[PDB]
Symmetry: C3
Subunit: 290 residues, 3 copies
């Protein structure tokens, strides 16, 4: 039993092992050991990739799957997250995947519950499996992290993606750059140098775009002309290194943080990221259940 909650508490060796496993499974290697066991997907926030890649991963591992929403479950009757987990243990669930609006919802749980918890996202906190498939995608491309320059752009302080990726990339020996509206920068995220998109887009081996976390803002603010100012425009992408890649955890808001024509251009690895997500998540479930 191993939780996957925060990227900062996962060692370099474990990351290295998870990537190898994921790569092998992607290669065709299979395993049935978990056939018949039960996984529960609890998503209290909207999702497509994370949620359904987990379901695919679970079913490829031969597992039965229970899918829980926040509006149809007894959470409507005031049940706590912990009780929901204990309930799921009681009816035979072996592992739980959770996405929740509350930053660090898992701290209370990991010490109390008896089955592995896989964090599919905690508000603006952590997003471990996104980080892992990001790393995998990067390593597949450059076959190393050391000496890489990776720039993360946009709404940083509301991003569990950036918060997971910045520390671990630095830890793996890469240089991390930030950019975007100064208002949206993170003082709790020092693992990167704040520069401008125009500066970073030329020194970056990786250009990671972020969606604006509109649903997470205290107050809605104008974002007219965001693309020109902060986004990856065609002209900006044309100034990227030959070997550089474009990444984005999705969903993309075409015409906002990236030009519509770039999403599926030569240097884009956005959809490749989604492919790797499945195998990364298969690996993570195996790690969780031994």
């Amino acid at each position: 039993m191993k939780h996957l909650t925060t990227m900062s508490e996962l060692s370099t060796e474990e990351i290295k092992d998870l990537l190898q496993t994921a790569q092998e499974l992607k290669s065709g290697k299979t395993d049935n050991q978990l056939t018949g066991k039960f996984a529960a997907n609890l998503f209290f926030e909207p999702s497509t990739r994370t949620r359904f890649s987990f379901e695919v991963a679970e079913k490829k591992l031969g597992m039965n799957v229970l899918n829980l929403d926040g509006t149809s479950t007894s959470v409507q009757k005031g049940e706590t997250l912990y009780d929901t987990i204990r309930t799921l243990e009681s009816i035979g669930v072996d592992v739980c995947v959770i996405r929740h609006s509350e930053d660090e919802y898992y701290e209370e749980l990991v010490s109390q519950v008896n089955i592995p918890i896989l964090n599919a996202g905690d508000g603006c906190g952590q997003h471990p499996t996104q980080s892992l498939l990001d790393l995998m995608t990067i390593y597949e491309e450059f076959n190393t992290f050391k000496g890489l320059t990776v720039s993360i752009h946009g709404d940083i302080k509301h991003s569990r993606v950036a918060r997971s990726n910045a520390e671990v990339l630095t830890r793996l020996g890469a240089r991390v750059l930030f950019s975007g509206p100064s208002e949206w920068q993170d003082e709790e995220n020092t693992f990167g140098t704040y520069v401008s998109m125009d500066e970073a887009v030329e020194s970056s081996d990786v250009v990671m775009l972020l969606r604006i976390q509109n649903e997470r803002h205290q107050s809605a603010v104008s974002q007219e002309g965001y693309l020109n100012k902060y986004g990856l425009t065609v002209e900006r992408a044309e100034r990227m290194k030959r070997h550089a890649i474009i990444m984005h955890p999705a969903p993309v808001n075409r015409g906002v943080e990236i030009d519509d024509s770039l999403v599926e251009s030569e240097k884009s690895r956005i959809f490749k990221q989604m492919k790797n997500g499945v195998f990364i998540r298969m690996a993570v479930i195996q790690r969780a259940l031994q």
Copy 2:
């Protein structure tokens, strides 16, 4: 790869083959060609028959199923339908079933995506699997379409069922009649003769009833005494040909377009339609992935 979007682009030959395949599947034919493959059901409008007959179909084919609604997916974050399909492709989905409010949502998709799209309904546009199962049911009854007189009643204007059935029935050599409030007739559906229910009910070999598309009208209008005025009353049903049948795409609004006692009367094939739905949908999936 073969999409299924509009009935008007389905050849007479393809139709006949789908009906034959459906019959074989109905009579127990099976194979594991599709076992373990993934099907995704994207339903953005309510549904019971189409959605779940598809799920049953997919599972009888031995497929793994993913169910997406639109309020719990990342469409909520602004993701386009196109990006949603590509996302599903990336994670290993082989076929997508889509029901959407936007007429012809699929026109954009079919030229761009790399997996079969099965249209489960586009606003007031087309509803091909309904048409196919309607044809199957009629064919089981008369072993022919040539010379048949089929009347379609009620809210034609907002009916993707009427749109699909009218063109294809006349194309198959049937005579089509329309009835219902003149206000709800469709000038862009000229494949039938407009008459009154009272006339059509004695001339018809098939009486096809439609539900009022309340949720699709620009503004709500009274519908008091609809049954007596426009609907299939007991008195009207008693004037039907001895060998004529009653059909309805469902759900039925008992007391509106049809008298409560008729839904499961001798001449009714309403539930037989739902039965055929599964096999028609199996056949369509087999066609898409051949």
Copy 3:
């Protein structure tokens, strides 16, 4: 085909049999008689234990599962519950599980539908599988019902649990005590003796707590200090018989009807209830389909 609607129509012999079957199931026994059949779970009210224990039970029986709610189905188009059930029969569903807001929704169905119906809860009416859970857990504890004193506390008026449990308990030879706010007492449930919590907690072999049915009240009222007044406080739990147990159909509102520290205390069988729920529900499904 044996429906399960209300406890009062379930004989003592049928009950003892379901409990023996659930025990054998709980010990690991299974068979293949239901492999590949279809179960449908129609939940129109929120639920965690009942809905997902049913799904688990179903999967453990080797069945395919269809999950329907209220907002995404064609109930939205005005389809009656009856037509919904008949529709499911037509597409190949062998048994239906239903939780609905309308008391006794099932009495118009039992005489009309052609497949077994399993009531997962009808408004403030009955909750048969919960009751069976309770009986099982109670029987596991004391190995008998005769001579037992069982107290049920709180919002009796709006409890389908209390209604199922009260009669069947006294029928099995146990004495039932009632407790809680006098306004929330039920005149349509006279199978117990109203007393104060402080009294019952000392004379009870089983102390069964109920959640306040806030979502079911015609008018909201204050419930300040509910714990200290009507609930199971730490102080009160200390005065329980040595061999007595705490039960609660869940979910619990920690701090309302029970002190936070008692939910998982030595005398609590609340989570054991959830465990037995699966096997009871397996047994009930086996009974429904012969």
